[model samples]
Target: MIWEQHTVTLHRAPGFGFGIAISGGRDNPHFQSGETSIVISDVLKGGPAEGQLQENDRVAMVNGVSMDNVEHAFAVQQLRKSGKNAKITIRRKK
Candidate 1:
């Protein structure tokens, strides 16, 4: 399958989160067990990531920090600490 790598920027506001749910990674049992890639599981509407990200997109980086070979909880923590704006790199099937 063809693929595209790109970055999506999401801004945070009061009462509004990044609006993206991430899953899958090394040591994670919920999704794609034994994998190191983090996947975007959900993108909620009326939020920062709405219309900017998709569920199937795989996370590659956040705020310039690499996501490759990271654990699931660590990946999630990285995203949560990404301040007001986050530059998220994603791999998508094209």
Candidate 2:
């Protein structure tokens, strides 16, 4: 197991206090992260691209035009702030 360290400050921002992150890639659309070949962190809506996803699950793809790249994921995230529902896709454990 591994420990993830992050800092979150509470100061009334206008929405919920949660976030997501992703990293690492093999440049393969079929390359699943759970195959012991990749590592992704903070799967925003519970990222299964890193293996947190299960079979027959539905994950909603973020449609925000602002979130077009890695550099903007967090920035766009801050704009979104929070929500009550989230759909995620993940690769099963091998």
Candidate 3:
């Protein structure tokens, strides 16, 4: 049931400007009913969070939206509207 598709963008640390698409994943990446998470598909460029974020990392929050698949639509909408500097949180397995 692939409801939607979303991409993950990583902002460089220290007041990092803009953001770079780090990876992409299917909706409900984490299988969490609430805030759906998008897994890291690949680090596109800039090596942003290259070592920090890894595959299967669950996005906990995006621009304070609770990082859920339900919000993926909104996130992509905002991105399309020139939204930048989104705050993203990830849960990585060690």
Model 3, residue 39: distance off in Å is 1.8
lDDT of 2 by residue, 20-41 (tens): 4433223312135332222234
Candidate 1: stretches off by over 4 Å: 29-34
Give the 10-residue window scoring lowest on summed lDDT in candidate 1. Answer: 27-36
| Winning model by TM-score | 1
Candidate 3, residues 9-85, lDDT tens digits: the string is: 65544443343343333453345444345544544345555555555566555666654544445545543343445
Write down the lDDT of every candidate, Cα atoms only.
0.84, 0.32, 0.48
lDDT of 3 at 17: 38
Residue pairs clashing, model 3 = 35-68, 36-68, 36-69
CA shift of 55, model 3, Å: 2.2
Top-scoring candidate (lDDT): 1
RMSD of 1: 1.7
The local lDDT score (0 to 100) that residue 29 gets in candidate 3 is 37
Q: Which residue runs does candidate 3 get wrong by more than 4 Å?
A: 1-9, 12-36, 69-71, 78-84
Show model 2 residue runs off by greater than 4 Å: 1-16, 25-39, 43-82
